């Protein structure tokens, strides 16, 4: 019986779950910060 590993080297990163969580958190926070800042800049411009 054979064990093919097609994992792409994913096993070698340490703490893959926490790393993936931090990647998603970073991308999510960047998206929300940019969205909120854009909306508030738009509202300030419209008010002015």
């Amino acid at each position: 019986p054979v064990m093919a590993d097609l994992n792409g080297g994913l096993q070698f990163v340490p703490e893959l779950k926490e790393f993936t969580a931090k990647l998603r958190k970073e991308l999510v926070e960047t998206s929300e910060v940019r969205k909120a800042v854009s909306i508030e800049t738009a509202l300030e411009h419209k008010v002015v």
């Binding site: 508030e40 509202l43 300030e44 008010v47 002015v48």
Partner: protein
């Protein structure tokens, strides 16, 4: 104006300023932003129901010279 932070002792201490300056504009964006995001602190607090004290009758004087001269 001054921006202050609330301390653990419920004491507001200045940690920054609001300093907005603009020429021709249709409004103040600072107040709009603060209304939309924050909450207004009203110093006056209404009771659950008003408490009537009394209905009183006063009279305007026949002449206004006594008040005018004083």
């Amino acid at each position: 104006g001054p921006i202050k932070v609330e301390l653990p002792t419920k004491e507001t201490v200045e940690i920054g300023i609001v300093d907005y300056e603009a020429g021709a504009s249709h409004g103040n964006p600072v107040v709009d932003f603060l209304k939309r995001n924050g909450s207004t602190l009203e110093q006056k607090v209404n009771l659950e129901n008003p408490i009537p004290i009394a209905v009183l009758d006063s009279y305007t004087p026949s002449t206004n010279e006594p008040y005018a001269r004083v």
